[PDB]
A and B are shown apart, each in its own frame.
Chain A
Amino acid sequence: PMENFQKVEKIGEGTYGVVYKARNKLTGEVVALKKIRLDTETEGVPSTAIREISLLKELNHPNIVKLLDVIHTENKLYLVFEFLHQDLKKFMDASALTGIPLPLIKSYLFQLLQGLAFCHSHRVLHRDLKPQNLLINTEGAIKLADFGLARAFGVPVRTYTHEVVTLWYRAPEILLGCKYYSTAVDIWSLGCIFAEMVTRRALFPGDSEIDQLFRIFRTLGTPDEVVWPGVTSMPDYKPSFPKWARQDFSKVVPPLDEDGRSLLSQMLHYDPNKRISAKAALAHPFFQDVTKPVPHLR
C-alpha cells in the first residue's frame, strides 16, 4: 500500500483537496501526495478526480506537473504528483519590491504558453489558470497544476459548464454569458498573469461578476459590435454599460517594451475569435530571442 512514503509537511487544503509533501526516504525522492477520503464520498471517486487523472495520464509535457501514480488503499485514493517547491503567487508576493526581472517574466510566460499549447493541441482546456496553480522549481521551470476544472473539448465543441475560472482571471465572454467556449479563455488568464508579473498587482481585481466586467471595460474600453461582433446580442450585455476609452498600454504595463505591449493586447483581445493562440504567441517577436529558425513544406 502506502510503502516508502513519509509525510514531511501539509502543503495545503482548498478545493484541490488535502495535499502533503512526502519523501521516498529509501530514495530521497520528494513527491506531492493528494489524499481523497473515499469513505466520506457519497458519489464515489469524485467526477473532478476521474477527469483530472485520465486527462493528466495523456498530458505528459515538461510544463505540466506530472501524475506519477494512483494508489488505492484503506478507502483512501492517493494521487502522487511530481513536486515543486513554490507556487507563483507566493513568488510574486516575495518579489513585489525588487520586481521579477524581465528575463524571468519572458521565460516564465514562454514556458506557460508551451504547456498551454500542449493542452490545446491535445484538445484540453485548463479553465482555472491563476498564479496559485502555476508551480516553479529551483532550476527556472514553471508548470501548469490543478486539472480538476479542466475539460477535453470536441473538435466540433459542445456547451460546457458555465461556472469556470476564478473571477480575476475570467474572460469577458464568460462574464457576458457565452453559450460555447474553448481555448481563448485559457489565453485571457495567461494575459492577466503576464501583466500581474509586470505590475506586481492583479490586473482586474473584481469583487463581483459586474465589477469584474466594469474593471475590464475601464482598462480596455467598453466593447461594441465593431471591436467584438455579437457582443451587443450576448445574454448579459446591457446597452447601459458605461463608455470608457481603452488606455495606453505604456501606462497599464509601464515596464514593457513594444513587443510585450503587442503580445498582451492580443492576449486580451475582446473577440474570442481573434485572441491570439498559445502556438502563435510562442512565435511572437517578444520571444524572438528565445525562438529560432524552422522550415515548412506542402
Chain B
Amino acid sequence: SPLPVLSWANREEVWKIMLNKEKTYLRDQHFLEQHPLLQPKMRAILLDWLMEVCEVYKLHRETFYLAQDFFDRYMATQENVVKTLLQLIGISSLFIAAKLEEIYPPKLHQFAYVTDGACSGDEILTMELMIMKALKWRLSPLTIVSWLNVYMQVAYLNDLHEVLLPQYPQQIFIQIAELLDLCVLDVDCLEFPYGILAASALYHFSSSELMQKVSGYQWCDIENCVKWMVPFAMVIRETGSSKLKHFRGVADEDAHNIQTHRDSLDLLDKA
C-alpha cells in the first residue's frame, strides 16, 4: 500500500479494493489460440490504429487503454473470429470508451467515417451492445495508464499527503507512457498484471527504490516483467525520449493526458 493515510477512506481499504478489482478483471496473452485463423501481429496493427485515431480526435490515454482492455477481454469470451471484423470490434471498443471517458465525445458518424465505410454507424451500435453484453457490462477496469497516473502522484508528495489534486511533471509521464504504449501492441504484455506493467515501465525510467515507494511491488514482483520489458525499454532509449506537445483547445495542466502517435511500426519488431 504505497498510499499515505487518506482523509476520505482507509488508504489500505482504497488500495485493496483497487488490487481486489484487478483480480476480478481477467486477461489472457493466449486468447488468440481461441481464434486460430488470427495472428498476434493483427492485434498490434489494430491498437496502433486506435492510437492514431485517438490523437486526431484528441482523446485521453485512458480512453485508448479502455478500448485496448475492451478488445482483449471481449476476444477471450468469443471463438474463431476472422480478420474481417477486427476493425469493427476495435472502433466499437473505442466508441464505448470515448462515451465513458470524454466530457464531449466524438459523435457516432465520426467513428464510422474513419472506418472508410468498412463499418456503418449501425454495425458499430450492434457491436457495442454485443461487446458490452459479452463483458457482462464490466467496463470500469484500472487501465495500464491509470496505474502510471497513480504512481506519478505518489512519487510527487509533500506534507499534507493530498493524493487527489494531481502534482507531477508532464514530460516524465509522456516518456513512460511511450514505453507502455509500445509494450501493449504485443499480446505477451497481458501475461503481466497492468499494475506491474506500469510499475516495470517506471522502473526503467527511474529505480527499484522509487518503484517500491510509489507501487508497493518488491523487485521480485516486477522482476520477470522488467526482464520481458527490457527489449522495448532499450529500443525507446536508442531513439531518444519524445516531447510534451500542447494541444489545440486542450489546456496545459491537461496536455499529458492526450493520447499521441509516433511510428511505433519497426520499433516493436526489434524484440
Contacts and interface: CB of A to CB of B under 8 A. Distances in A.
A70 interface: yes
B86 interface: no
Contact of B9 (A47, A54, A120): A120
B51 interface: no
Interface string A119-149: 0111100000000000000000000000000
A155 B149 contact: yes
B140 A155 contact: no
Interface string A145-181: 0000000111111111100000000000000000110
Interface in A256-298: 273, 277-280
B268 interface: no
Contacts of B103: 160-161
Contact of A47 (B100, B137, B160): B100
B166 A156 contact: yes
Contact of B100 (A51, A72, A179): A51
A53 interface: yes
Nearest to A162: B103
A122 B164 contact: no
A156 B129 CA distance: 31
Given A57-B137, A70-B137, A156 B163 contact: yes
B9 A155 contact: no
Interface of A, helix, strand, loop or mixed by DSSP: loop
A45 interface: yes
A39 to B, nearest CB: 11
B10 A154 contact: no
A45 B127 CA distance: 11
B138 interface: yes
B189 interface: no
Nearest to A59: B140
A156 B149 contact: yes
B153 A155 contact: yes
B100 A50 contact: yes
B8 A50 contact: no
A157 B14 CA distance: 14
A220 B14 CA distance: 33
A51 to B, nearest CB: 6
A3 interface: no
Contact of A121 (B17, B96, B107, B168): B17
| Interface size bracket, B side | 35 or more
B137 A157 contact: no
A27 to B, nearest CB: 23
Interface residues of A, number: 39
A50 B163 contact: no
Contacts of B269: none
B140 A42 contact: no
Interface string B6-32: 011110011001100100000000000
A44 B108 contact: yes
Contacts of B154: 155
Contacts of B186: none
Contacts of A180: 164-166
Contacts of B259: none
Nearest to B168: A156
B133 interface: yes
A283 to B, nearest CB: 12
Contacts of B96: 50
B99 interface: yes
Contacts of A159: 251, 253-254
B124 interface: yes
B254 A158 contact: yes
B119 interface: no
Given A121-B9, A157-B165, A72 B137 contact: no
30 contacts: A42-B108, A43-B107, A44-B108, A44-B124, A44-B125, A44-B128, A45-B129, A47-B100, A47-B105, A50-B139, A53-B137, A54-B140, A58-B140, A70-B137, A72-B129, A120-B8, A121-B13, A123-B17, A155-B14, A155-B18, A155-B149, A155-B153, A155-B163, A156-B168, A157-B165, A159-B251, A159-B253, A180-B166, A277-B9, A279-B9
Interface of A: 38, 42-45, 47, 50-51, 53-55, 57-58, 70, 72, 117, 120-123, 152-161, 179-180, 182-183, 273, 277-280
Interface of B: 3, 7-10, 13-14, 17-18, 21, 95-96, 99-100, 103, 105, 107-108, 124-125, 128-129, 132-133, 136-140, 146, 149-150, 152-154, 160, 162-166, 168, 251, 253-254, 257
Given A57-B136, A57-B140, A156-B149, 17 more contacts: A43-B108, A44-B95, A44-B129, A45-B132, A47-B100, A47-B105, A54-B137, A57-B138, A58-B140, A72-B133, A120-B8, A121-B9, A154-B149, A156-B150, A156-B166, A158-B166, A180-B165
